[PDB]
Structure 1
């Protein structure tokens, strides 16, 4: 199976290592990038399947970053982060290969839950059971 890999493009390295460890723990080889170049490096270094492109402020729109990682790997997908769906770029984001546009209101679990249900390795903590 796929070894389950992630790329977190967030400048708020708090949220970034937050997401990092969260998915990482499920099995996700998550690599934290604060910028799209970092991200380019990350894709080229690990080849993540799920790249959380924080379109907020890190450096560039997760779209332009998702497509550059799409050109190096259209195998890849992106979980671009938004100010709760500012549309336009948001539409095109998911449209180009972003699975989800997660915002300020995040359950944390819904994001890790999402990554598993999109590409599942091990996930959770204790087997695959009804409770998360």
Structure 2
């Protein structure tokens, strides 16, 4: 057994696995969602130590989801992902108490730093 979990929501395009195989390589329990609520439940279900969700979402942007999510509790930790075009939102996410903000073009290696910086990860 291990000690690490992570959740992925939207932005799924073969990247979720990339980081998956990473956390999975350790035996960590990771899950995926296709919305906020679904992530809210899957959040506690897998009670991960980190969650990755992308704002850009079909049918009710995450602007609110991520909002209500954090507004719900200040202990919720989730990462946002979107091109550096809606800095406006990305900004708020900061004052919202978000972990950070990544741009479409992102590297896992980089995410391994924040994760390895926030969580007891072991990335090269």
Coordinate RMSD, CA, aligned: 3.0
- Normalised by the length of structure 2, the TM-score is 0.75
| Consecutive unaligned residues in structure 1, runs of 5 or more | 125-132
Q: CA deviation at 1:94?
A: 2.6
What are the superposed Cα offsets for residues 50-90 of structure 1, whole Å, 9 maximum, x if unpaired? Answer: 21111123554445333444466532211100112521111
Distance 1:77 1:22 in 2: 19
> Cα–Cα, structure 1 residues 48 and 97, in superposed 2: closer, same or farther, change >3 Å?
farther
Residues 24 and 56 of structure 1: CA distance in aligned 2, closer, same or farther (over 3 Å): farther
| Aligned CA distance change for structure 1 residues 112 and 7 (closer, same or farther; 3 Å) | same
Confirm whether residue 52 of structure 1 aligns to residue 52 of structure 2.
yes
* Change in 2 beyond 3 A, CA 1:107/1:20: same
Counterpart-to-counterpart distance in 2, 1:35 and 1:18 = 20
TM-score where L is the length of structure 1: 0.72
CA contact under 8 A between 1:62 and 1:80: conserved in structure 2? no
Gaps of 5+ in 2: none
